[PDB]
UniProtKB/Swiss-Prot annotation, chain A:
The WSXWS motif appears to be necessary for proper protein folding and thereby efficient intracellular transport and cell-surface receptor binding. Isoform 2 is expressed at similar levels in both naive and activated T-cells. One of its GO terms (cellular component) is plasma membrane. Keywords: Disulfide bond, Glycoprotein, Membrane, Phosphoprotein, Receptor, Repeat, Signal, Transmembrane, Transmembrane helix. Residues 103-198, 203-291 form the Fibronectin type-III domain. Heterodimer/heterooligomer; disulfide-linked. The functional high affinity IL12 receptor is composed of I12RB1 and IL12RB2. Il12RB2 binds JAK2 (via its N-terminal) through a membrane-proximal region of the cytoplasmic domain. Interaction, in vitro and in vivo, with SOCS3 (via its SH2 domain) inhibits the STAT4-mediated activation. Binds STAT4 through a membrane-distal C-terminal region. GO terms for molecular function: coreceptor activity; cytokine binding; cytokine receptor activity; protein kinase binding. Receptor for interleukin-12. This subunit is the signaling component coupling to the JAK2/STAT4 pathway. Promotes the proliferation of T-cells as well as NK cells. Induces the promotion of T-cells towards the Th1 phenotype by strongly enhancing IFN-gamma production. This is Interleukin-12 receptor subunit beta-2. One of its GO terms (biological process) is positive regulation of type II interferon production. Induction: In vitro, up-regulated by IFN-alpha. A motif (WSXWS motif) lies at residues 282-286.
Swiss-Prot record, chain B:
Belongs to the IL-12B family. This is Interleukin-12 subunit beta. Heterodimer with IL12A; disulfide-linked. The heterodimer is known as interleukin IL-12. Heterodimer with IL23A; disulfide-linked. The heterodimer is known as interleukin IL-23. Also secreted as a monomer. Interacts with NBR1; this interaction promotes IL-12 secretion. The gene is IL12B. Disulfide bonds join C122-C149. Cytokine that can act as a growth factor for activated T and NK cells, enhance the lytic activity of NK/lymphokine-activated killer cells, and stimulate the production of IFN-gamma by resting PBMC. Associates with IL23A to form the IL-23 interleukin, a heterodimeric cytokine which functions in innate and adaptive immunity. IL-23 may constitute with IL-17 an acute response to infection in peripheral tissues. IL-23 binds to a heterodimeric receptor complex composed of IL12RB1 and IL23R, activates the Jak-Stat signaling cascade, stimulates memory rather than naive T-cells and promotes production of pro-inflammatory cytokines. IL-23 induces autoimmune inflammation and thus may be responsible for autoimmune inflammatory diseases and may be important for tumorigenesis. Known to be C-mannosylated in the recombinant protein; it is not yet known for sure if the wild-type protein is also modified. Residues 62-149 form the Fibronectin type-III domain. Glycans are attached at N47, W141. The chain holds residues 176 to 327 of 328 of the full protein. It comes from the Eukaryota.
From Swiss-Prot, chains C, D, E:
Heterodimerizes with IL12B to form the IL-12 cytokine or with EBI3/IL27B to form the IL-35 cytokine. IL-12 is primarily produced by professional antigen-presenting cells (APCs) such as B-cells and dendritic cells (DCs) as well as macrophages and granulocytes and regulates T-cell and natural killer-cell responses, induces the production of interferon-gamma (IFN-gamma), favors the differentiation of T-helper 1 (Th1) cells and is an important link between innate resistance and adaptive immunity. This is Interleukin-12 subunit alpha. The gene is IL12A. Glycans are attached at N60, N74. Its main location: secreted. The keyword Electron transport does not apply. Disulfide bonds join C4-C77, C31-C163, C52-C90. It is found in: Secreted. Keywords: Cytokine, Disulfide bond, Glycoprotein, Growth factor, Host-virus interaction, Secreted, Signal. Belongs to the IL-6 superfamily.
Amino acid sequence: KIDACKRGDVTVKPSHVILLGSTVNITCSLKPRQGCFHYSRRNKLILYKFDRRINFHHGHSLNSQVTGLPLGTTLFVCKLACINSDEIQICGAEIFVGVAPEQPQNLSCIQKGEQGTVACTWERGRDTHLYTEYTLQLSGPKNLTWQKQCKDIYCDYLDFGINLTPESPESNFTAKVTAVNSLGSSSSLPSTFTFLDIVRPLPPWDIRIKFQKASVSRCTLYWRDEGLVLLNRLRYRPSNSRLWNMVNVTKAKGRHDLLDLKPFTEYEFQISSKLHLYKGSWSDWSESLRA
Amino acid sequence: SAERVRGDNKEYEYSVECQEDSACPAAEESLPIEVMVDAVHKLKYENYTSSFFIRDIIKPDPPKNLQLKPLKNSRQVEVSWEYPDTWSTPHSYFSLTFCVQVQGKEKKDRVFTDKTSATVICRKNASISVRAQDRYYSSSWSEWASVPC
Amino acid sequence: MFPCLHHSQNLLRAVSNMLQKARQTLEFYPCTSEEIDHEDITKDKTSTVEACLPLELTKNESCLNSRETSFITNGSCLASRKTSFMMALCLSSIYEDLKMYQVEFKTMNAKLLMDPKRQIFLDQNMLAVIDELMQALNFNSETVPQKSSLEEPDFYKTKIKLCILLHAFRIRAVTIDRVMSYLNA
Amino acid sequence: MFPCLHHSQNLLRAVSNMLQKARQTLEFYPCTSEEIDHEDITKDKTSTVEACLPLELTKNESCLNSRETSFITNGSCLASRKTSFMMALCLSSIYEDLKMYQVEFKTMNAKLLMDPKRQIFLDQNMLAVIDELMQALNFNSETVPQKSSLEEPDFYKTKIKLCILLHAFRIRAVTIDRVMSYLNA
Amino acid sequence: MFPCLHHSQNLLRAVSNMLQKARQTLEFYPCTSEEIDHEDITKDKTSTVEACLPLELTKNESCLNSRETSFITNGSCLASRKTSFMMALCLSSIYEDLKMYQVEFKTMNAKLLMDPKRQIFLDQNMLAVIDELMQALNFNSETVPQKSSLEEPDFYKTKIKLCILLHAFRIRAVTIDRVMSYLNA
Ligand SMILES: *[C@@H]1O[C@H](CO)[C@@H](O)[C@H](O)[C@H]1NC(C)=O
Ligand SMILES: *[C@@H]1O[C@H](CO)[C@@H](O)[C@H](O)[C@H]1NC(C)=O
Ligand SMILES: *[C@@H]1O[C@H](CO)[C@@H](O)[C@H](O)[C@H]1NC(C)=O
């Protein structure tokens, strides 16, 4: 059995993890068999924080009560100094000062495209100086559920690998995030999302410009995107200065008889689609098409 | 430009400022730039021709905003520096390598770090100095930037 | 021997076995060809019905509507400089047909698993064959993400829709097999 | 971290080690950067010199000559809908540059092996890195066939040509590395 | 060239880099060879100290204690009919030494990850090299299961134990390297 501390053992009261503001009783105790080979009233049993002397007792039992510890870890190492020999490190304690975990104030779940993996994002709050474990739970109408745990201390987001297929377009799904640390536990308020709110249409991948198969000013734009789109929007703004973009386009993959400027000067084109007008987010504008 | 006294001759240094006026940007150079100086003195005429590439003659200016930040309760000190504004942008396509020597006033404390922050134990009686060179190709080393430690 | 033709022959055989299992499992649900209407999900989205024809059969080219969905995705089944556009558009449309069906079949299977009993579930082997054929058809193959629901759907509706899709898919599988045989010979 | 950037960083390092070996092996043959002229085989065939630039640097777009060699081959290094055409043309041109060099390097290596002694031979690892990067750059990668000759060539000419190519290739390798770093950041 | 010798040379180099990182990370914790006692976990369990010797050095055979732990596990590093029992017992004992260390190193790493900060963590590459060498040493390799704890251990004790193990393991790594060199030559 490998043992880190052989000469003596050091105890901490109440524990290595303490609430910000508490006082720890670091006590260095030396086993009777171990000790300075020659008894002398010169040898000492020092205690050091970051190699800084805090106490010194000739006797094997050393007691200290450190206070006002800041957030972080402080290494208290208790070395033995003999009469002529160099100091031998005996044992030490690492103390993590921590505070109660922040509750996530805002939780949002976004699925990219009709086929996508749901991803939920939260505001962690102040960082407790402690290991942090995050649990994300998603439940449907009745209480079935999916849970995943983000063991990583810092998590940008947690993604449910399982895709969500909604039994009906109007359903209620509720998501909650729980943060647990040695000192305490904070749980976010339940947030209820309908499937349309979670889904976000993909930007239209395709784009084509045709001048109505003619030299005429009128232009026809042939783009392609996800099948379930009941709305759309197009940018007809002149390239040199942005002006106005039509709020809505008809449910046509291929634009027809769009009003375009008579010159053939290059014009930037951007396109967006809305899965549902009543409760669907707008898609990101498609890569600009030059001319 | 200057009137130094090498020996007793007092050599005088004359310099020209030349800018490539090519509008089209190009990733790599295939032709060396050629410079001709038609020196004229009284009734005597001489001409000198030099051929070179911009990357070969490039010499970076010293690293900017060098500051030392001691780590809490540790002997080592973190030192952070920033890219020179004069150097071409973006800083991703064109990159520099920083060599940090802590010898100040053991012979060679030079450490080559691509990162803009390195941590070096600081003896109270020495200075920490940083140098910049083109990371991609061998280039003339920059002037040392020294911050007292 | 054509490797894609072998995959297509495997596809038709896999659908034939799954269709036989479906009729045996759902005794009351009506799943005979006579009582099940023909409904094709890919009716307007893809041009397999027109583009996938022998070169002799297609001539006017007027009926190919403005190069409909002419993505012409390059793939390992053919070679880029090997065959005419009429077969290049056909291979892309066949890839799209398999993508539309696989996404739907996975959605049905995820709902079927929730059933307290296991009366019927889509054949994993048949789904794997569809994915393998798509990988050869187009290099930029997209693998469908695992689908699941947080609630329980009505099972009768899923079982009637399943029978309607299986029969329509079987007709599509023979159409793919005929094209693969033509490419080989 | 960008996987193609890691391959490009591996390429520049591999060329640097091979170039050092070449100078040590060929003591008499002149292989110092000063005595070796810069000659680029891909001078007119590819547009890497113009297309591969940071987006800020390229603006007029007039200098891109009529979309020269605008194959725009799709590949695993980028994603089809991820980056602007300026980087799509650049990745295709870089793939073409590596194809032109690999075909030539294999021809030189096959001639070098015939030498009664083994003074110098191209690094197998460097050739493998070039192939790996090309596979990521373009899905339709062509592997060069084993090259051999039925006669013995003059060796001095091959050793002078080798030094000229190695130095030019090293400059190309840094150019690829700069583009990969820009794509990552 | 011996493949196991290459793995052993990789092992010694990986430990050397990890040991340097450990000294830099733990500035206060004492991790210099002078202040760290030599303690070997495999002191009595395995006979590598005695069995792994050059054939010339070992003669009386009395010191081999009753074929201690004479499992003689067959493996891909040697061939079954290739070398004498003295090296067969040695290869088995080396496999056992790597198993005892890997199980312990994984336990330490699982405790280290819980630290609020990331001052130090065992090199994943070093652990992978240990597993690769064991796979060659014995066909019946057991992969250690992912280890985790439901509580938080004192970190100072783990960091002192870590330094004691790393230095002892480095001495073991040189001993394995010497045996692999002897097998090659
Ligand atoms: C610490 O120890 C002292 C004496 O041993 C005692 O008076 C005090 O109550 C202790 N405090 C804590 C927090 O344990
Ligand atoms: C679902 O869970 C919530 C909270 O646990 C509870 O209030 C509700 O009654 C549950 N519903 C059913 C049907 O069990
Ligand atoms: C979801 O909840 C809202 C408000 O709580 C309610 O109006 C709506 O009917 C619910 N939807 C379903 C399907 O129960």
